[PDB]
């Protein structure tokens, strides 16, 4: 028996002598002040565990000099990794923890260097292959009263780190149990090869023998272990000692890098307009030597009042009428988003900060030819033109503290005129985009969320843009009528009929692949293709639009805001690639892309790498012979697309689709696509569409979605009244659009029976483009219903009005139940029986006003 005569004493020791012993003589790190700011949401400075300190005392003693690629095996919250981010000779850190239920889930931190730390949870480091790394950490080992077990556990990790270890590598490896003649054997052998020594840390509790194989030490294995067994056996009878306290680690703030650079930015274009911003400022303009950008070009920063949020209020007025769903987690776990400068930069590091390799000479040709053709088609029966300051000032009606109060006020129009003749002449000055997150009610918390960005532009630079490319959305170029494929100017509810009318086409299945971050995947080839709108212009109309395309679309300057360790700045950056009117372009190129892909299925061309002469002829013929036939095969709204090709050879035609940028989401690249054989199953614009027979026998096609997605979004906002008029906007929307849901209607008739009548609905219910927002009136909702489905709905022939909500039909139960209903559950039944009661408690809380009652008897 080794000094493991101590484990015999330890685990066989009094429950309280245990918690005394554990702390006596050691070195603690008062955490009861960092653990307290992390719950507040404070994301700076703080270490996430008592482990930044641990790895601090080793690093500060030169026992480990992490550098370069650092891989952390067992990151947990992020103690060693986040700490290593702050360090200087480190470049990237890769964190890995099993995590999950029982284990320790990682924490996201704004701490200095954080952009250099990527943490992934859900990883059995034992089952993942080794990568190149300049330093290798590992803090795995669960202790146990059975030392034969943890010799096995330690043996298991020692075998792992040896796979990852290289002769030149820096390391730090928790040896959970080092006094067992199993590990001392393996350590003695691991030490001959890789060298280093076993070092006990003065920060570890006395209830373990943890020693660390640190690369840059040296020392006898056996004797260093018994040295610790003695020192730990002593403290069994050494009169309880306090616990020397260290200050925690101040892990800092802010983002480093400046090393890489990788975007030759035409300065002879973005130049005359970057000196503006550093003129406008300069009492602030610095150059952050620690900018995070790699595939965007950096230019300097300036001080900025922070802008964003990460809030989430429960619409407790919709929530008090939603009593059966307080348990369902895909409501009670759907936060708002995160627009704070940190969550914007956290999204930047992941979605916008990428590049896209150049397409192959042959893809390049196919994309030209097809656009060459499409543009020519799309305006077979259309002509481009300018849009009038009048039209713009006219468009002011919902779409200088104002924009209404900025166009009717002479000043702006001379400001837009100076830069106007500048574009004409070949420059911008005032043509920056100013990024910001889009608040959205995407779910994903724990108690979190984040996704998108919206390139907001100078209220006067839009005019130069609107004036050039406004004819697109204004003469309805991408309306189904003229584009055959587009669905512009079409009601979301009427988007169901358009898919039904496409199943009518003869072909394979219906396909609705989603592109992974479309705007980021726009290439210059897609930019210079969409530029061809100009070939079909002339005069002072080309020039202008040419400037738009060449000056602000292919060559744009952007500002974004990130937290420095000294306030929120606003960096200024430029990319040539990517895209910010970006709907018709996003529809134009999605068509072209889905044309090239349809073509691939059918074999009209065989290789992306080179299109042969006899092959770019077939392309033309195909395009001229069946081009309009295949446009009719698609339902395309921006980046969102539904397709029904000839055959299911489609679902494998990908050399083009992946070379153009347009890489599908949530699916390995060279894996065939998912077909839909039922068009009431295809998703398009975050909805699907059932076909619902009424009583008189008329065909309804009606939008639907996972009924949970609908309650959750409704129970969030960005007074009792300002929030009661937010439910009524959702409730009015559920009628009219989701009327076919036993749950939603029953819950909507309750919202409008607890929100006073005459109270007008307010703030957006959806940022959908195809949303008519027709649920905002204060009219009888059965009047509007007839107005949408019967009076104005074209696919509706018998204009015989309906005049009762009882004559309005639900889906069949099991569709309702499939698409997510709760009918059939004992709560849902209790919730309807006793509903005039939760109406009451919401009326008896929204004051004492005028109340109708819609609730059917
Ligand atoms: N097989 C495995 N693969 C990956 N992670 C594991 C693992 N087994 C345990 N872990 C995780 O590794 C962590 C080690 S304890 C975490 C401490 C952390 N390294 C720090 O510096 O603060 C545990 O949280 C556990 O969740
Ligand atoms: Zn300009
Ligand atoms: Zn449905």
Residue numbers in the entry: 8 to 406, 419 to 466, 468 to 600, 605 to 742, 747 to 885
Task: Provide excerpts from the study.
With an aim to further understand the conformational diversity of NS5 and related functional relevance, we crystallized and solved the structures of DENV2 NS5 in two different crystal forms at 3.1 Å (form 1) and 2.9 Å (form 2) resolution. Each structure has two NS5 molecules in the crystallographic asymmetric unit, and has the two molecules arranged in a dimer through pseudo two-fold symmetries with highly consistent global conformation (root mean square (RMS) deviation values for superimposable C-α atoms are 0.74 Å and 0.57 Å, respectively; chain A as the reference). The DENV2 form 1 conformation is clearly related to the JEV-mode conformation with the JEV interface partially opened through a pure 20° rotation along an axis passing the vicinity of the highly conserved GTR residues that were proposed to pivot the MTase movement relative to RdRP. The partial opening of the interface results in the reduction of the interface area to only about 900 Å2 or 59% of the JEV interface. Among the six conserved hydrophobic residues forming the interface core in the JEV structure, only three of them (DENV2 NS5 residues W121, F349, and P583) remained as part of the interface. The tip of the ring finger no longer contacts the MTase in the DENV2 form 1 structure, and its electron density becomes weak but still readily traceable and its folding is largely consistent with the JEV conformation. However, the motif G region in the pinky finger is largely disordered as observed in the DENV3 structures. Based on these observations, we propose that the interactions between the MTase residues 113 and 115 and the phenylalanine (residue 465 in DENV2 NS5) in the tip of the RdRP ring finger are essential for maintaining the canonical folding of the ring and pinky fingers, and the folding of the motif G region in the pinky finger is likely dependent on the dynamics of the adjacent ring finger.
Being a unique natural fusion of an N-terminal methyltransferase (MTase) and a C-terminal RNA-dependent RNA polymerase (RdRP), the NS5 is the largest and most conserved protein encoded by flaviviruses. The NS5 MTase catalyzes the guanylyltransfer and both the guanine N7 and nucleoside 2′-O methylation steps in the capping process, and is a single-domain module adopting a common S-adenosyl-L-methionine (SAM)-dependent MTase fold. The RdRP module is the central molecular machine governing the viral genome replication, and has an encircled human right hand architecture with palm, fingers, and thumb domains surrounding the active site. In this work, we report two crystal forms of DENV2 NS5 that reveal two conformational states bearing clear analogies to those observed in the JEV-mode and DENV3-mode NS5 structures, respectively.
